[PDB]
Amino acid sequence: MSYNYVVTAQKPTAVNGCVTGHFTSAEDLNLLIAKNTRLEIYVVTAEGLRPVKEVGMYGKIAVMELFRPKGESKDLLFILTAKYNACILEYKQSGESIDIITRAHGNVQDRIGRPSETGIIGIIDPECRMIGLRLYDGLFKVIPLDRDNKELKAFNIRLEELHVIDVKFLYGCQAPTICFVYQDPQGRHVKTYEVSLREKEFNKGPWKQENVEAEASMVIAVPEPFGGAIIIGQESITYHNGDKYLAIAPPIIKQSTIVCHNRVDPNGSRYLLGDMEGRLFMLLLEKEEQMDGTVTLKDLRVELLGETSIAECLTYLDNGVVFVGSRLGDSQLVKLNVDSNEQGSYVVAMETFTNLGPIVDMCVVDLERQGQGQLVTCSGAFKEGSLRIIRNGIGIHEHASIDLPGIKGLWPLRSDPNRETDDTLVLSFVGQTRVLMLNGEEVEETELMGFVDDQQTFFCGNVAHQQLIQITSASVRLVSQEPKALVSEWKEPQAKNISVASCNSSQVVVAVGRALYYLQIHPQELRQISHTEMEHEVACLDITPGLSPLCAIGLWTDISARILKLPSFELLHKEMLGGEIIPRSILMTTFESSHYLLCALGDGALFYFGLNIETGLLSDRKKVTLGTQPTVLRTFRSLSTTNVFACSDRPTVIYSSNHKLVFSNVNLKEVNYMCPLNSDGYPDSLALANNSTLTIGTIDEIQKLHIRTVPLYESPRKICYQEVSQCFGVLSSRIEVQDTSGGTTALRPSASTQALSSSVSSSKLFTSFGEEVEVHNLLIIDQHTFEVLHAHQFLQNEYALSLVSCKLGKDPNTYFIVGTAMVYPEEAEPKQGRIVVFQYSDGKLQTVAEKEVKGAVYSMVEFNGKLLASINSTVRLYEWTTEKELRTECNHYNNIMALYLKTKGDFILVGDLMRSVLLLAYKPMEGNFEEIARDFNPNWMSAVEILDDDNFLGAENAFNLFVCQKDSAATTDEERQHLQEVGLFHLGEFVNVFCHGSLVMQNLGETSTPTQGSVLFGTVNGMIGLVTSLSESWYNLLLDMQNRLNKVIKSVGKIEHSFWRSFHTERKTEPATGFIDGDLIESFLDISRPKMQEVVANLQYDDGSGMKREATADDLIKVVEELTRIH
């Protein structure tokens, strides 16, 4: 009884693996990057990375490798899923179609066995004879590689050493040889085995066990001709080849441990290394020894190249370019030049790819445009900590700017031989018309020979029959094309002022006062076509198609929209367009291959209507609030077919996708007037003129997602937004080394040490040299410039957990409430905390209140003007007294630590890390808490959210989502006190934070939406989700359509959707219930016509009376398109 719909609004960005090789073709060099469920195939070129293919796989890529067996032209890709869905894939392209064919597929899990503590290890024999997987302790799984092994049958081998740290295949062995480091109570040892496929067991290794360093961490296999293995630990780098043995103890690597590597030479002469703090090392192997043709090591000099992002997976691209794959920072593309050496660093950055993960906390705030939300996250960690500001809209990439003091209309003109190019544009000033002709990048003004100078021109375009028509306020004028001289001047019969002018390719309609005149363009002649009159003044007129069947006219004195036959005088149709104000601009467009009448009134409302091209007009009534200013509708050709730009205080681009007009905002403050300008210098551009300056630039394809970075150089923990102060309060932490002077020196310039004003907490309510100590800060950041306006430093040994910005009690002021806990290394459970209430005013931060609590304030919320706190395992309620001091009101003692607190009305949801969901209600007539229900189940819970008063969403172990509801209508107490669980889903992501909101325009739309509510969640990988509620019939229809989609869509690796989405746990797995996979439903639009015909045969689409068993195909389009607008 939940019927939820979950979709991904932003695909994950964190990278957890990258390989290079000849994947698409034997000659091309590709970079395959796995972010989580997505596999991206790029092509490495001299300029950089050219994306080629994006593929979504039904799983999380835990292991990916490129191998080329014998008799193959290009490398194949072997991918293992965290659910043990092993597969082998092949790239296949035929001219324009890109498809990845699955060479083999199969689940390789075991019925019984504990997964290894070190994790999944997947290795391939360099001779391409076997695939070795270490999934379970004491069991080595081997998959033979033969063309007939299309089901991936694997056999297990018993391993006597249970704890294997790292294992890899050696190079240069006649038989498949593995080399690994294992742990014993006697210490750490390196051992080798000779795996034999024929008898399916191990053998004696080429070289016996050798004792290694106590912290031997990683094993790298040196290829031919050197052979052997290199063992890297915390304080030494060793090379082992049997008789050969060497070790080094360089001091530059003692600071941090190496966690990643990547070979840079085919012969393994040099190696690339990276550590935890993110600095590039260069292991150097010397081949100076050559006795009788044998090549052996001589030295292992280690050189530090520079500092980069915190890198998880290095990969050296061609010609001194390294792709630094970061997961907690930002992916980079840097240069390893050996001649720059600007200050001792060998590395300079080229590129930087966006990476929103990890998303520790987020908030939804209306920063710029009222009604549309914006996402502000706390991304990154350590030196990569930063604030990402996400927004939804079409991004106009600026190309040039010029100065114009409030232009009142722009129009390109053609005064050149026919070449389908734009040479000059006339800008209508306040009283004049300054033709700013610019063949290239000019800015001067060159008046047209056939156009007036100071007449406030209404329209100026290129008419048919080789002429340019420039209708001005006084009278409509024309200019010849080749002669370029005024040949015809269509003076008004009454010589009045042209109020509203409408011009077309070959017909011009001019409104003088309340009268309308129609004229037809003739070669070197202005022959009037018809004359007529109107009862009311013509507020707006527009004629669009050679010959317009009808002309749309607005009434100034009646506030109604009519369509009348241009070759005649009798109106074809009419309607009352609201009547609130006079219409501002009405246009006819064919955006969706139909006849649409977009009329915009002066109040900012578009009274959208549907008309008929042949005769008459339909109604198709629609009203959309496009802004608060009279928009100037102007279709710009730099689009799919026509598009429309409603230039107003809230600019929007009106484009038809699936016969349903989307209205996406633009990244501009306000546009006074816009016009296409396809200049030769800037083809397919668009000139938009604002209230101060006029810019020229292009636009994005459709409805992108834009991210703005604010680096802080320290880890941000929590973020809250304060409306009245126009500020963001963010908690942060920096690592400071413990020097031998009693102080704490920092490591790099952080945001807290670069603030305008700084403060240090001073309260009195209560080591080793080199140790790293956390220093916690509260940063106040302006919402416009995103500069750190303030930074408050807490006491020593104080850890700040929570942060709420809210107003308490009857106090008009809004405060920052922070809950901290004094933590010491000696003790495990904190015994004392602190509730501190700050108030940011006049750019100065002051401590309004300060309470001492005995425990750790794990979370706080705002409960109807009362601060609700969670001290250890107790939930307490605090009342804001008139003297600005928190006073306790009620307590409720639990047996679980209240890590999570969510309120909706008077329903408190209390959660912990043991998935022990608890529910509470606050009786206000009595003033004490009382428990309604309870649902305990041993598992790990990451986050929890209140979907509504009846259902609750949570994130569980193994990247799962669950939905629990209480049956308040149950007649038995035991059922009322228990929360029935009626939803399961395998998301594949670790959700940290849940928040209510949406990133699309909030429009009631009278009929509303098929989805109720909206919840966004952010994950560690940096993926933004969106979950909504659905109706019963809608859920049933979507489930049936999903089942039929499963049989038509061919997934990569042939992983079944039900198995992938099945609720997964180390102990017990169940099929998914109560959740609809929005990705699969939205994938319905990307398949061809016959596939969509196959999907729908008997869905019984209609539910509002009747069944309509045919169900058509475009009805599902009208369904999926309405489901796509929610994100």
- How would you classify the pairing of strands 757-760 and 788-793? parallel
DSSP state of 1114: H
Q: Residue 360 or residue 804: which is nearer to another protein going by CB? A: 360
Q: Is 148 left (phi over 0), alpha (psi -120 to 50) or beta?
A: alpha
Sorted by sequence, the CB contacts under 8 Å of residue 117 that are 6+ apart come out as 137, 163
- Determine contact, residues 728/780, Cβ cutoff 8 Å: yes
Query: Which residues, listed in sequence order, are joined to residue 732 by a DSSP beta bridge?
Result: 716, 777
Count the site residues for another protein by CB under 8 A. 59
Mark the segment that binds another protein (CB under 8 A) among 192-200, 353-361, 504-512, 640-648. Answer: 353-361
* Using rule CB under 8 A, residue 711 touches another protein: no
Beta carbon nearer to another protein, 17 or 268: 17
Q: How far is the CB of 141 from another protein (least distance, A)?
A: 18
Q: Which is nearer to another protein, 569 or 940 (CB)?
A: 940
| Smallest separation, CB 377 to another protein (Å) | 12
Residue 1120 three-state SS: helix
* Nearest Cα residue to 457 out of 439, 443, 476: 476
772 backbone dihedrals φ, ψ, rounded to 5°: -95, 125
Decide if 782 contacts 814 (C-beta within 8 A).
no
- Decide: is 715 part of the binding site for another protein (CB under 8 A): yes
Which residue in the set 280, 993, 1023, 1030 belongs to the binding site for another protein (CB under 8 A)?
Answer: 993
Interface pick for another protein out of 942, 998, 1051, 1062 (rule CB under 8 A): 942
Q: Say whether residue 674 binds another protein (CB under 8 A).
A: no
The residue from 75, 125, 312, 945 that contacts another protein (CB under 8 A) is: 312
Which CB, 234 or 439, lies closer to another protein? 234
Q: Is 179 in the site for another protein (CB under 8 A)?
A: no
Asked whether position 977 contacts another protein by CB under 8 A, the answer is: no
Q: Work out the end-to-end distance of the chain between its first and last CA atoms, rounded to an integer number of angstroms.
A: 24
- Among the listed ranges 45-53, 113-121, 403-411, 810-818, the one in contact with another protein (CB under 8 A) is 113-121
Binding mask 889-918 for another protein (x = CB under 8 A): --------x-x-------------xx----
Q: Does 825 bind another protein (CB under 8 A)?
A: yes
Residue 1039 phi/psi, 5-degree rounding, is -65, -45
**Cβ-based neighbours of 53, under 8 Å, separated by 6 or more:** 40, 41, 91, 98, 100
Among 69, 115, 610, 809, binds another protein (CB under 8 A): 115
Query: Out of 72, 117, 307, 787, which residue is the one contacting another protein (CB under 8 A)?
Result: 117
Residues 6+ apart with CB under 8 A from 812: none
For the CB of residue 442, give the shortest distance to another protein in the complex, in Å: 54
Site string for another protein, 39-68 (x = CB under 8 A): -----------------------x------
Minimum distance from residue 343 beta carbon to another protein (Å) = 28
Query: Interface with another protein includes 1067 (CB under 8 A)?
Result: yes
> Is 118 or 612 the residue whose CB approaches another protein more closely?
118
Q: Single out the residue of 99, 906, 1066, 1070 in contact with another protein (rule: CB under 8 A).
A: 1066
Q: Which of 215, 224, 441, 533 binds another protein (CB under 8 A)?
A: 215
**Using CB under 8 A, which of the segments 355-363, 642-650, 840-848, 1034-1042 binds another protein?**
355-363
> Is there binding between residue 737 and another protein (CB under 8 A)?
no
User: If binding is defined by CB under 8 A, does position 272 make contact with another protein?
Assistant: no
259 is a site residue for another protein (CB under 8 A) = yes
Q: Is 12 a residue that touches another protein (CB under 8 A)? A: no
**Nearest Cα to 963, choosing from 941, 976, 947, 987?**
947
User: Does 16 interact with another protein (rule: CB under 8 A)?
Assistant: yes
The answer to whether 217 contacts another protein (rule: CB under 8 A) is: yes
Q: How far is the CB of 274 from another protein (least distance, A)?
A: 9
Closest to another protein by CB, 35 vs 634, is 35
Question: CB-wise, 338 or 828, nearer to another protein?
Answer: 828
Contact predicate 5/1011, CB 8 Å? yes
Instruction: Give, in degrees to the nearest 5, the angle at Cα 365 between 361 and 371.
Output: 145
- Give 29 or 276: the residue with its C-beta nearer to another protein: 276
281 binds another protein (CB under 8 A): no
Phi-psi region of 1042 (alpha: psi -120 to 50; beta: other; left: phi over 0): alpha
Should residue 18 be labelled a site residue for another protein when binding is judged by CB under 8 A? no
The yes or no reply on residue 934 touching another protein (CB under 8 A) is no
Calpha distance 1093→1112 (Å, rounded): 8
Q: Which helix (H) or strand (E) holds 525?
A: strand 525-533
Residue 323 contacts another protein per CB under 8 A: no
Determine if 752 is a binding residue for another protein (CB under 8 A).
no
Site for another protein (CB under 8 A): which residue of 19, 212, 336, 360? Answer: 360
Q: Which of 257, 354, 497, 1083 binds another protein (CB under 8 A)?
A: 257
Residue 759 binds another protein, judged by CB under 8 A: no
CB-count burial class (<10 Å; 0-12, 13-18, 19+) for 746: middle
Of 248, 309, 301, 317, nearest in space to 280 by CA: 309
- Distance from C-alpha of 980 to C-alpha of 789, rounded to nearest angstrom: 48
**C-alpha span between 24 and 34 (Å, rounded):** 16
Which residues does a gap of C–N over 2.5 Å follow in the chain?
A: 545, 766
Residues 6+ apart with CB under 8 A from 588: 542, 544, 552, 595, 596, 597, 598, 611
- Is residue 168 near another protein by the rule CB under 8 A? no
Among 202, 353, 786, 940, binds another protein (CB under 8 A): 940
For residues 325 to 344, the per-residue mask of contacts with another protein, x marking binding by CB under 8 A and - elsewhere, is --xx----------------
Q: What is the Cα–Cα distance from 1030 to 88, expressed in whole angstroms?
A: 38
Tokens of 1115: 């009805």
797 lies in the binding site for another protein (CB under 8 A) = no
- The CA distances from residue 248 to 207, 213, 214, 503, 844, in Å, are 21, 11, 15, 83, 55
DSSP secondary structure, 382-412, as one string: GGG-EEEEEEEEB---EEEEEE-SS---EEE
Q: Which stretch binds another protein (CB under 8 A): 221-229, 781-789, 825-833, 1078-1086?
A: 825-833
Give the separation between CA 603 and CA 584, rounded to whole angstroms. Answer: 8
Secondary structure string (H, E, C) spanning 705-748: EEEEEEECCCEEEEEEEECCCCEEEEEEEEEEEECCCCCEECCC
Amino acid (1-letter code) at residue 772: E
Instruction: Report, in Å, the least distance between residue 185 CB and another protein.
Output: 6
Select the residue interacting with another protein from 104, 1020, 1072, 1099 (CB under 8 A).
Answer: 1020
Window of 340-348, 843-851, 884-892, 935-943 that interacts with another protein by CB under 8 A:
935-943
Residue 110 binds another protein (CB under 8 A)? no
- Which structure tokens are listed for 968? 């308040």
User: Residue 166 CB, nearest distance to another protein (Å)?
Assistant: 5
By CB under 8 A, residue 313 contacts another protein: yes
- Interface positions with another protein (CB under 8 A): 16-17, 62, 115, 117-119, 163, 165-166, 183, 185, 187-188, 214-215, 217-218, 257, 259-260, 276, 312-313, 327-328, 358, 360-361, 381-382, 715, 717-718, 799, 801, 823, 825, 828-830, 858, 897, 899, 913-914, 938-940, 942, 957-959, 990, 992-993, 1020, 1066-1067
